[PDB]
Write a protein that binds this ligand. Structure first.
Ligand SMILES: Nc1nc2c(ncn2[C@@H]2O[C@H](COP(=O)(O)OP(=O)(O)OP(=O)(O)O)[C@@H](OP(=O)(O)OP(=O)(O)O)[C@H]2O)c(=O)[nH]1
Ligand SMILES: [Zn+2]
Ligand SMILES: [Zn+2]
Lengths: 50, 49, 118, 119, 1160, 90, 99
């Protein structure tokens, strides 16, 4: 929207062609991470941390 | 309900007036139901499955 | 990978009227959320953004408000470029860009658009 | 007689609407999903008068009704088939001959041919 | 000069058949392809079930291809693809149609109880109407020779009849055949000739079918609908959004079953269209037509005949009808586990900090941006998302006087949802006032309640002026208080009385408040002595005001200090002089009736605070030695077992009837049980010895348990009897009773045997509880559905007649009086006085003026009172005729909602009703309201005459009684079975008993009278609540019985067509407009008819309200046939439409709009 | 009227009309020309209208009449513009 | 659980969540009985329209809230407009005429 185009133009565009869908801990609860886990697809570039 | 055959009651009012009307039933483990019941006119009917 | 995409076409597939949790009574098509709609909060923020920007371009000059307004195309549908604005304002290209840059210079203190960013 | 007297005399009013009763005292082929609604509609709701609207209204399947008209065999043999096929060719021939009589069909064929050679 | 063509305000909605051109009017294109979405591009096909040109665009403002994108072309269609680029919600509202080749019958108007296409044509449904359109037996469409007009012929008969005549009686077969059949039908000429023929020399041997069809034909012709529309030739299409195919998670689309149906019907219809262009074999094409019929019938309404399937699922496909034949989630709401909040008031509730934060989110935003702090709306969002201290203070401002209403799961009555003032509490649970914890029927087992936030301005005032807890002091069911103190508080105030002799007592006198200083400073006890003090009482009379009255009464420490809580008025002391039990509510009641609202509320808070505080001070507990067993227990048991031993020994040697010795020995153990119970009670009650001055005296046991029992606080005689005494006769699964009662008790040990016996009682108890709990609401639904339409209107009409109210007296042979059933009742007219004058005409019996009905002695025990049963009102209820019984002390406000409140109050105590010449229980209530004839109905004399035998068993027959006198005889039928009560020759009156058995309500209303039948119902429905001990005012029973007598039957000759049984609504309003219109001879006389709750609710004006509870498929169809319209005053039908309810806060809106709809 | 609100109903029968008129007055205060009669004391507009009704001022006829005066004030005092527009289309 | 405003289902524009917030509480027949008993016409008015499944209503009223105007400005709920299209989807026609 025109107003948003102007607004970003005032503070820097950086309008990446990507969105966001990161896993966030639900509002309210709080604790400590005790174990991580990653199941990669058979034929996909494995991750560093993985 | 355990397989085999047992005779049920159906006692009490089932068509007004009120008169017993007993009935037999055979329950298979793997098959079709085979029932035998009476009527007010004392006739015998059979229910397959 | 072609086979992978092939199996993504199989089946009818599933219908919405399928029971799931077996509550009273569950339906798969009842868990599907709408996404084409925008949040009422989002709508309110967009509205307040219009008013905010409509109130910010007031603290500018005519040969600067119209410049920023017309360049990025706001409240006028069809947005124009440096040439179509440079011809309607005598001095072409770079000149109209100078003011276009100067206007952006003015907006480095107000916090309205700043917080509206996020 | 049978259906009417049994339905009326028994259902007075069957108290808990004993459905699993008279549906077996009905003739024809059973276990249908058609006659099911015509009984749950008469027992209650419009009581008394509905029990008089039932008998007066009492005074089936695609495939089974398709095999019915298909039942008319009229099967054929090699002689039969060839006979029918012969009538076909006879009809077609007479039609083509009738078209041959039409001169404008020939001249039109000629005109469209010159159109073909003219690309 | 209005005539606007926009979407403005509507006063009514109309329902009727739709013409093929009518369907075209909705058509934004024609679906022609079974295709939905592309296999690769995932893009809507050209003319498929999800077209973009026909229906609506996928994205909001960008077209299919992409030639146009933004809002530049919102009114112009695309060049390459005619796609109107507007919104995406357009795809939700756009219709569309499919135009079939050969005609097709609508499944509803075809086979739905009565054959609408058949009965209108007078032709058998599944018999003839099936075989003639399934391509089997050709039918005739009018013949002027040999053949009639609607006979059925076979192909052989067809060709034979064609050879005999032909070319002059052409009549096709199939769908279009029935089409021409309905089209050729002339409703007008048939309406005339049928009226002629079905009236010529015919008794009651024909009149049935005659009046039926003629009314039906007249209705259809007057409806405006053409019989051609009965079978559709153009089938409309439901919008794609209402049956979408949305991609789920990682592929795997999700579509509706309607897409499968529409795809099938499209396929078969297309093949049918193609076959009617290629080679045309009769069998093939006719089959495809039957298959097209299958597809269409399946899409419209599956039901019904085998059930179409496919789609991999073994379950059927949800057709259009199945989606509309058979809960309103809302924003700004929440729920959590409840917790007791003693420090709270009566109008406050504990609302969690984080919970209240998320609830008033939008309000916090606005208030933040209002003051400052947050520069913008999103700034407020980021400011509350990051709970930054200051935001909380803002929260304390927004929730200041913004009421929040709480709700419990089991909503039986109006007090299920009550409003409170939000009070922030550092916690995640919701706290509640323990006083209104009884109205909710809520415990703290772990129960959880819900909260709603009144958004609208008038919605906040509605919650404050109506749903506020402070306005619900008295119960809507019974005038008695509902916020009355319960277990803990009452126990405390019971401990603040209880006069104990000596023990730091003595008659040390002081002056009220000063005594408090004495209590805290020890020295003196608390439960002494008695002791005397100066009480400054206050009373008023005649000219109101206040009159002081200082005196010296002999109270106690507790009574003195507790006296401070008592408000300005009240008789004082004497209310405290008693104790704490049931008068604890009486005091609250009198405080309300003599003072007002606010004083009663603060009085409630004070007595609650006091009760709790002193209850804690008391320290009443429950040790094992608190439940003292009687010493004579084993003695009584041995004596009882000795008696039963003698009886068994007698049975051994014959003598006594062994067949029923079981019953008499049960009386032995039962009597023994009463012996143990009486012994335990006489022991645990008094006891003690103390030592007053010169010692030796007796009071009543301070034994905790007894203190709990003699002060409400959940503790009954039966329970205590099981604690220390014994569990008596135990029930057996056979229904019989075991002849070996539980000799032991819970205080003692319990053998495995008797416990395995008690498990049956516990099992059946929980089971029966689960049944009646759901069955109670099951009855409530019927009650509400039938009554939720009448509202007190037209202020206060005239009329004086009304049921003569009299104290329900079983004292004929058992002695039991109840004379409080007259209060807040509007008097009929000056109900006399042993002398002269006294009672006025329309004077409502006040709470203090009902006590004046005791100054006229026990002589006056009969007063005529206006009731909702009578009342010459039309479509509402006179304010006077009703009463006043609410949480309010005054009469019911004009435009309330008597119906729902009545039904709720009736079905509220349904939870505590034990199901079974006395049925008794909830089932008894149901049978009484349904107006069902008994299994052995009695008989009455219709007309007063002389009883004589009418031919001893000459039928048939069975005896016959003929009461004949004055003129004309009557021949009743006695079926020998069951005797009589009146010999031959004797005379009887109009409605005398001649069977001495169960009476039928129909006969009572029909012969005895309306006052008699209503009196019967109310006095019979109360008798089942008497035993259950549930207090409920008679008004509500009279309310449901009011519309229970809604319709009647006219028998004479008038503008109404005789046999038609119509409601007294139109009847009375039309009979009043005929005596002075043209002539009183153009109208007949009516006769009230008793019909059950279900039968009454079945009949209703609105077709939408009817479409609610009863079978939608029926009502919607029959309402479609005749051009009916809801317009539109019903509560129920006005709820689903989403508008103001024609009652309460509304009404005025509906009243203005109702009068407004008189111009045209 | 933080707890009845019952003391206001006897001033205008039927609690429902009480809610309507009170909501009417509260609507005037929350948005538009405020100007309360009874002292605020930090109370919401919800209760302020009820307190006024309890006080004896601000009823149904009162609001209607003041609306009549409000209309006669906005219209009659600014007719110089409308009259000039009346000559627009003759 | 608590919900000011969140997502809605595609079929019926009714409140639901579990992905970021919580699907709002359900009213029902038992509650509409009470509201009718009290006479809270506007409470039920909002609770049946804007507060639930009124497409433009919820947004229009939300804007009225943040501005401190309250009021309502309601409209026909989609849970009835859909019913109109469903019944209209059959051979039967229903219309809402003015006066
Ligand atoms: N009847 C009536 N009461 C009012 C009115 N205005 C305030 N009150 C009382 O104010 C009392 C509460 O006082 P606070 O707790 O201090 O709150 P406030 O700070 O006083 O607000 P305020 O300025 O008075 O409006 C309530 O106590 P309670 O005794 O009721 O609660 P309960 O009997 O349970 O104790 C109300 O009765 C009014 O206009 N009419
Ligand atoms: Zn395009
Ligand atoms: Zn009346």
């Amino acid at each position: 929207t025109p107003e948003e185009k102007l607004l970003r133009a005032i503070f820097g565009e950086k309008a990446s062609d990507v969105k966001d869908s990161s896993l966030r801990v639900p509002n309210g609860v709080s604790g400590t991470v005790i174990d991580v886990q990653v199941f990669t697809r058979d034929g996909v570039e494995k991750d560093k941390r993985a | 309900r355990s397989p085999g055959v047992f005779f049920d009651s159906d006692k009490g009012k089932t068509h007004s007036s009120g008169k017993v009307l007993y009935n037999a039933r055979i329950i298979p483990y793997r098959g079709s139901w085979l029932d035998f019941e009476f009527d007010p006119k004392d006739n015998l009917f059979v229910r397959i499955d | 990978d072609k086979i992978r995409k092939v199996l993504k076409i199989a089946k009818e597939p599933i219908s919405m009227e399928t029971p799931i949790g077996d509550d009273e009574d569950s339906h798969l098509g009842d868990f599907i959320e709408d996404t084409t709609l925008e949040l009422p909060l989002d709508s309110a923020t967009t509205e307040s953004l219009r008013a905010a920007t409509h109130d910010v371009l007031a603290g500018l000059t005519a040969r600067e408000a119209k410049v920023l307004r017309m360049r990025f195309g706001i409240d006028m549908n069809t947005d124009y470029t440096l040439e179509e604005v440079g011809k309607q304002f005598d001095v072409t290209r770079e000149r109209i860009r100078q003011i276009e840059a100067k206007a952006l210079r003015k907006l480095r203190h107000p916090s309205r658009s700043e917080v509206l960013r996020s | 007689q049978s259906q009417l007297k049994l339905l009326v005399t028994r259902g007075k009013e069957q108290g808990y609407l004993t459905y699993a009763e008279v549906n077996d005292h009905l003739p024809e082929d059973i276990v249908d999903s058609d006659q099911i609604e015509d009984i749950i509609q008469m027992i209650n709701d419009m009581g008394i008068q509905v029990m008089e609207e039932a008998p007066d209204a009492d005074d089936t399947d695609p495939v089974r009704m398709y095999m019915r008209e298909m039942g008319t065999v009229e099967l054929l043999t090699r002689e039969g088939e060839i006979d029918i096929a012969k009538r076909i060719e006879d009809g077609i021939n007479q039609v083509q001959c009738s078209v041959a009589e039409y001169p404008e069909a020939i001249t039109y064929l000629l005109e469209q041919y010159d159109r073909v050679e003219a690309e | 000069l209005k005539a606007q063509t926009k979407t403005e305000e509507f006063d009514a909605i109309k329902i009727a058949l739709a013409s093929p051109d009518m369907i075209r009017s909705w058509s934004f294109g024609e679906v022609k392809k079974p295709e939905t979405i592309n296999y690769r591009t995932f893009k809507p096909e050209r003319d498929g079930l999800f077209c973009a040109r026909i229906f609506g665009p996928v994205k909001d403002y960008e077209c299919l291809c992409g030639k146009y994108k933004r809002l530049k072309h919102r009114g112009v269609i695309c060049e390459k693809c005619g796609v109107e680029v507007t919104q995406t919600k357009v795809r939700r509202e756009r219709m569309g149609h499919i135009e079939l080749a050969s005609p097709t019958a609508h499944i509803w108007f075809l086979k739905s109880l009565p054959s609408r296409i058949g009965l209108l044509l007078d032709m058998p449904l599944r018999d003839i109407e099936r075989v003639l359109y399934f391509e089997s037996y050709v039918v005739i469409e009018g013949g002027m020779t040999n053949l009639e007009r609607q006979q059925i012929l076979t192909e052989e008969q067809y060709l034979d009849a064609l050879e005999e005549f032909g070319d002059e009686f052409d009549a096709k077969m199939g769908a279009e055949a029935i089409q021409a059949l309905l089209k050729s039908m002339d409703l007008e000429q048939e309406c005339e000739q049928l009226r002629e023929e079905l009236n010529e020399t015919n008794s009651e041997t024909k009149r049935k079918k005659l009046t039926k069809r003629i009314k039906l034909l007249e209705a259809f012709v007057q409806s405006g609908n053409k019989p051609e529309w009965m079978i559709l030739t153009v089938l409309p299409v439901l919008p794609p959004d209402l049956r979408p195919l949305v991609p789920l998670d990682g592929g795997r689309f999700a579509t509706s079953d309607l897409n499968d149906l529409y795809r099938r019907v499209i396929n078969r219809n297309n093949r049918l269209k193609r076959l009617l262009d290629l080679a045309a074999p009769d069998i093939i094409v006719r089959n495809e037509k039957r298959m097209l019929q299958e597809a269409v019938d399946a899409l419209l309404d599956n039901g019904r005949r085998g059930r179409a399937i496919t789609g991999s699922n073994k379950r059927p496909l949800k057709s259009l009808a199945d989606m509309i034949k058979g809960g309103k989630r809302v924003d700004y709401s929440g729920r959590s586990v409840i917790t007791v909040g003693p420090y709270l008031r009566l109008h406050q509730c504990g609302l969690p900090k984080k919970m209240a934060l998320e609830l008033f989110k939008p309000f916090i935003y606005g208030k933040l941006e209002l003051r400052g702090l947050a520069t913008t709306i999103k700034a407020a969002k980021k400011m509350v998302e990051r709970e930054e201290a200051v935001v909380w203070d803002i929260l304390d401002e927004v929730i200041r006087e913004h009421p929040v209403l709480l709700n419990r799961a089991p909503t039986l009555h109006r007090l299920g949802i009550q409003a409170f003032e939000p009070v922030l509490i550092e916690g995640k649970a919701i706290q509640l006032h323990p006083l209104v914890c009884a109205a909710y029927n809520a415990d703290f087992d772990g129960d959880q309640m819900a909260v709603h936030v009144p958004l609208t301005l008038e919605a906040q005032l509605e919650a404050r002026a109506l749903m506020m807890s402070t306005n619900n002091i008295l119960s809507p069911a019974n005038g008695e208080p509902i916020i009355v103190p319960s277990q803990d508080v009452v126990l405390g105030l019971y401990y603040m009385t209880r006069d104990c002799v000596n023990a730091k007592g003595e008659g040390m006198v002081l002056t009220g408040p000063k005594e408090a200083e004495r209590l805290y400073r020890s020295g003196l006890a608390s439960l002494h002595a008695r002791v005397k003090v100066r009480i400054t009482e206050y009373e008023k009379d005649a000219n109101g005001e206040l009159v002081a009255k200082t005196s010296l009464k002999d109270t106690t420490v507790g009574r003195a200090i507790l006296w401070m809580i008592v408000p300005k008025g009240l008789p004082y002391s004497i209310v405290n002089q008693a104790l704490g039990k049931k008068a604890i509510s009486k005091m609250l009641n009198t405080c309300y009736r003599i003072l007002g609202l606010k004083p009663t509320v603060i009085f409630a808070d004070q007595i609650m605070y006091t009760g709790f505080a002193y209850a804690a001070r008391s320290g009443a507990s429950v040790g094992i030695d608190d439940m003292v067993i009687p010493e004579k227990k084993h003695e009584i048991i041995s004596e009882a077992e000795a008696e039963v031993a003698e009886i068994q020994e007698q049975f051994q040697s014959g003598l006594v009837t062994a067949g029923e010795r079981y019953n008499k020995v049960i009386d032995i153990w039962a009597a023994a049980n009463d012996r143990v119970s009486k012994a335990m009670m006489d022991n645990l009650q008094t006891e003690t010895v103390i030592n007053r001055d010169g010692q030796e005296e007796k009071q009543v046991s301070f034994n905790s348990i007894y203190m709990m029992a003699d002060s409400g606080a959940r503790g009954s005689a039966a329970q205590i009897r099981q604690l220390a005494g014994m569990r008596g006769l135990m029930a057996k699964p056979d229904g019989s009773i075991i002849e070996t009662p539980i000799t032991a008790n819970f205080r003692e040990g319990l053998n495995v045997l008797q416990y395995f016996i008690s498990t049956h009682g516990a099992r059946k108890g929980l089971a029966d509880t689960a049944l009646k709990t759901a069955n109670s609401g099951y009855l409530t639904r019927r009650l509400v559905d039938v009554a939720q339409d009448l509202v007190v209107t037209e202020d206060d009409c005239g009329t004086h007649e009304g049921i003569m109210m009299t104290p329900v007296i079983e004292g004929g042979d058992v002695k039991e009086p109840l004379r409080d059933r007259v209060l807040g009742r509007v008097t009929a007219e000056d109900v006399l006085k042993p002398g002269t004058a006294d009672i006025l005409v329309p004077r409502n019996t006040l709470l203090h003026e009902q006590w004046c009905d005791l100054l006229e002695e026990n002589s006056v025990d009969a007063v005529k009172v206006r009731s909702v049963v009578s009342c010459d009102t039309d479509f509402g209820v006179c304010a006077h005729c009703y009463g006043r019984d609410l949480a309010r002390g005054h009469i019911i406000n004009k435009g309330e909602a008597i119906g729902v409140i009545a039904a709720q109050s009736i079905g509220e105590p349904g939870t505590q009703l034990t199901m079974r010449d006395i049925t008794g229980g909830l089932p008894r209530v149901a049978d009484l309201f349904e107006a069902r004839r008994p299994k052995e109905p009695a008989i009455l004399a219709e007309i007063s005459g002389i009883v004589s035998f009418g031919k001893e068993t000459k039928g048939k027959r069975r005896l016959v009684i003929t009461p004949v006198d004055g003129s004309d005889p009557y021949e009743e039928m006695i079926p020998k079975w069951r005797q009589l009560n009146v010999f031959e020759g004797e005379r009887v009156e109009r409605g005398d008993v001649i069977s001495d058995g169960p009476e039928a309500p129909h006969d009572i209303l029909r012969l005895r009278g309306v006052h008699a039948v209503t009196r019967y119902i109310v006095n019979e429905v109360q008798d089942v609540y008497r035993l259950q001990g549930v207090k409920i005012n008679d008004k509500h029973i009279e309310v449901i019985v009011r519309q229970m007598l809604r319709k009647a039957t006219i028998v004479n000759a008038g503008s109404s067509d005789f046999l038609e049984g119509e409601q007294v609504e139109y009847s009375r309003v039309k009979i009043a407009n005929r005596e002075l219109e043209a002539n009183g001879k153009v109208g007949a006389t009516y006769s009230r008819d008793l019909l059950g709750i279900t039968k009454a609710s079945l009949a209703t004006e609105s077709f939408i309200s009817a479409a609610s509870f009863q079978e939608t498929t029926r009502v919607l169809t029959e309402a479609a046939v005749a051009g009916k319209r809801d317009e539109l005053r019903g509560l129920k039908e006005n709820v689903i439409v989403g508008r103001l309810i024609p009652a309460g806060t509304g009404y005025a809106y509906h009243q203005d709009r109702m009068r407004r709809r008189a111009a045209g | 009227a933080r707890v009845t609100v019952q003391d206001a109903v006897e001033k205008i029968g039927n609690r429902f009309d009480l809610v309507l008129v009170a909501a009417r007055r509260a609507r005037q205060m929350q948005v538009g020309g405020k100007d309360p009669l009874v002292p605020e004391e930090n109370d919401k507009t919800t209760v302020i209208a009820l307190r006024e009704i309890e006080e004896g001022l601000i009823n149904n006829q009162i609001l209607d009449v003041r609306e009549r005066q409000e209309q006669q004030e906005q219209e009659a005092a600014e007719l110089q513009a409308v009259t000039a527009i009346a000559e627009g289309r003759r | 659980h608590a919900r000011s405003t969140g997502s809605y289902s595609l079929v019926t524009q009714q409140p639901l969540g579990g992905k970021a917030q919580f699907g709002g509480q359900r009213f029902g027949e038992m509650e509409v009985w009470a509201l009718e008993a009290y006479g809270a016409a506007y409470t039920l008015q909002e609770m049946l329209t804007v507060k639930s499944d009124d497409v433009n209503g919820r947004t229009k009223m939300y804007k009225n809230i943040v501005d401190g105007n309250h009021q309502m400005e309601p409209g026909m709920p989609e849970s009835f407009n859909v019913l109109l299209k469903e019944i209209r989807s059959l051979g039967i026609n229903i219309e809402l005429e003015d006066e």
